[PDB]
């Protein structure tokens, strides 16, 4: 369930847009605009349980909160590290916020403008593109089509059960 939430300086989600088709049906009829990203993701995960896209209690479910620093922010590269650091803390807050839901274990991945441009074209979230990218380095036996339907939890084991060795 890949969704991209564009946030303002005040941490409020300006627009909720789908990265993948699964996220599109999930966000159908969701008013989550002008609200803080922390509550936005919390309601979003819970609605993924309601629609039944993902299993709440059955599997060790990894929920991915990935965030990238925007292209316009990256106009200059002066202390872009600082913005990334604050972004990492922003994501760390989202992580601690949404982990309060039943059997939700969260991974947070900070990404650059590259992962986001590619992720929206490949039809995934930034972090699911990022671990796919790394999984093609660690193996290369993972296709982009399967990534649309698979779990990010299953992607972690794709990366760890790496078979670029024969």
């Amino acid at each position: 369930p890949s969704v991209e939430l564009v946030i303002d300086e005040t941490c409020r989600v300006l627009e909720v847009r789908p990265q993948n088709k699964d996220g599109e049906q999930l966000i159908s009829g969701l008013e989550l605009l002008d609200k803080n990203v922390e509550d936005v993701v919390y309601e979003l995960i819970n609605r993924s349980i309601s629609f039944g896209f993902v299993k709440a209690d059955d599997n060790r479910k990894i929920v991915l909160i990935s965030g990238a620093l925007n292209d316009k922010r990256n106009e200059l590269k002066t202390k872009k590290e600082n913005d990334e650091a604050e972004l990492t803390e922003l994501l760390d807050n989202i992580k601690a916020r949404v982990d309060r839901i039943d059997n939700i274990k969260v991974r947070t991945i900070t990404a650059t403008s590259r992962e986001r441009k590619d992720a929206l074209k490949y039809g995934l979230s930034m972090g699911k593109y990022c671990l796919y990218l790394e999984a093609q380095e660690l193996n290369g036996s993972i296709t982009i089509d399967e990534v649309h339907d698979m779990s990010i939890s299953d992607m972690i084991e794709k990366l760890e059960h790496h078979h670029h060795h024969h």
């Binding site: 369930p1 890949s2 969704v3 991209e4 939430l5 564009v6 946030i7 303002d8 300086e9 941490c11 989600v13 990265q19 996220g23 999930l26 990203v37 993701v41 979003l44 995960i45 993924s48 896209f53 993902v54 599997n59 479910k61 990894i62 929920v63 991915l64 909160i65 990935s66 965030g67 990238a68 620093l69 925007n70 316009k72 922010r73 972004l87 922003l90 994501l91 989202i94 990404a111 986001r116 992720a119 995934l124 979230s125 930034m126 972090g127 699911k128 779990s151 990010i152 939890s153």
Partner: peptide, 10 residues
């Protein structure tokens, strides 16, 4: 303009 958060719920 701060950033974009791509979530993937499993």
């Amino acid at each position: 303009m701060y950033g974009y958060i791509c979530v993937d719920i499993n």
